[PDB]
């Protein structure tokens, strides 16, 4: 489903709950290494509310397992990501996704 590979640890105590806004820095890459999106490149953190289905299923279940301050590697399967349709012009069909996500804070 979604593989979470820890790069740098968080506080190990504060994990996102339903309704909280997750402030993250991310860099999206295809499984071939091609980068398609990065909040770091624009120096603008990305925010989304857990449980509102505002991001793909692999992002929700992956970020929910991280603690604040943790940097993790999220390998998302197509069925947890954009599936057979993908996103025209960015995500190919059945694309396995690799996300370098750092949970900055919760609001």
């Amino acid at each position: 489903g979604v593989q979470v590979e820890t790069i740098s640890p968080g506080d190990g105590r504060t994990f996102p709950k339903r309704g909280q806004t997750c402030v993250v820095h991310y860099t999206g890459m295809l499984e071939d290494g091609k980068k398609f999106d990065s909040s770091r490149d624009r120096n603008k953190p990305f925010k989304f509310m857990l449980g509102k289905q505002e991001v793909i299923r692999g992002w929700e279940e992956g970020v929910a397992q991280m603690s604040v301050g943790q940097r993790a590697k999220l390998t998302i399967s197509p069925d947890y990501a954009y599936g057979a349709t993908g996103h025209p012009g960015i995500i190919p069909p059945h694309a396995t996704l690799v996300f370098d996500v750092e949970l900055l804070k919760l609001e």
Partner: protein
């Protein structure tokens, strides 16, 4: 107020593909509040929406028109298409609930389409030129190829019409609906036609389309179809410009010879067999603005496609008027 520190407007999120960042597209899309339905047809629906109090346009495609949503989403996401006279793309999204729904989010233009605008309002020399020159500038921007990283290939609309042209608050127009668009790059001379069973609007079809003589493997042929349709749009706009206290009621092209929702044979008999063109009222030649427009229409309606003017040639003439 409902404002908290860290709130961002749409203009702040768009500063960065033509629209929002990829992952931001999904978040903004599913935070939009639908307000009023402003369009409905075979393509689907168009809704006036709201994101954080900002008006947006939401086009919800029907299941039969999924290929148009694919082409417009792919085009906007792969080509930097930001221009005053091309509809501003914000985001594209798909949902698997409520079975599937395909969404296209663009700028909202409260004045509506040029089709609706011309039926309620009349024009003067300033407002007519602003409308007409803006359409030419947007069409010329689509047709011309720009090189570099922030560049774009040559694009043909293939369904240009007053209903696919929106009037903005400043009086200028912008071109919308790129679902039937084709692309071309001069470096490799490759033509990208796409995969779409959707057919163009029959009332605006060029003669070479109706008699099946159009060279489908030549990108210049698709640009000249736009010029033909553009000339008909010029005819719609110039009718609504007042000169000497006279103005024409709004009428679609060929209103007097074909019925509503015309067929292929209706157009083929009028455009190809009889070689008919929209009538130019004589009062237009008593006005220098409508004289220049009348000259431009006739130069968009040549039976020979190669004789028609280019979109760039039309803009230069309108700039001098």
């Amino acid at each position: 107020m409902t404002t908290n520190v860290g709130d961002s407007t749409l203009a702040d999120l768009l500063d960065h593909g033509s629209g929002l960042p990829f992952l931001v597209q999904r978040t903004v899309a599913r935070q939009i509040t639908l307000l009023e339905c402003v369009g409905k047809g075979r393509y689907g629906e168009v809704w006036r929406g709201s994101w954080q109090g900002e008006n947006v346009a939401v086009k919800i495609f029907s299941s039969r028109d999924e290929k148009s949503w694919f082409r417009e989403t792919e085009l906007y996401n792969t080509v930097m298409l930001r221009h005053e006279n091309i509809l501003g793309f914000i985001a594209s999204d798909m949902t698997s609930r409520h079975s599937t729904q395909l969404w296209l989010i663009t700028h909202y233009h409260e004045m509506g389409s040029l089709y609706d605008y011309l039926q309620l309002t009349t024009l003067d020399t300033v407002s007519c030129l602003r409308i007409v020159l803006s359409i030419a500038s947007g069409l010329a921007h689509l047709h011309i190829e720009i090189f570099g990283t922030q560049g774009k290939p040559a694009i043909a609309h293939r369904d240009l019409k007053s209903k696919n042209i929106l009037v903005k608050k400043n009086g200028q127009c912008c071109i919308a609906d790129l679902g039937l668009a084709v692309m071309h790059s001069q470096s490799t001379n490759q033509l990208d036609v796409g995969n779409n069973p959707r057919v163009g609007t029959k009332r605006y079809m060029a003669p070479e389309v109706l008699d099946e003589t159009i060279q489908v493997d030549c990108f210049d042929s698709y640009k000249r179809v736009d010029i033909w349709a553009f000339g008909l749009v010029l005819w719609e706009v110039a009718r609504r410009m007042v000169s000497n206290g006279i103005v024409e009621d709004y009428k679609p092209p060929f209103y007097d010879v074909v019925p509503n929702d015309p067929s292929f044979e209706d157009m083929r008999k009028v455009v190809c067999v009889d070689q008919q063109r929209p009538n130019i009222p004589n009062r237009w030649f008593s006005d220098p603005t409508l004289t220049s427009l009348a000259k431009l229409m006739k130069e968009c309606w040549y039976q020979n496609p190669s004789a028609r003017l280019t979109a760039l040639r039309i803009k230069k003439t309108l700039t001098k008027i």
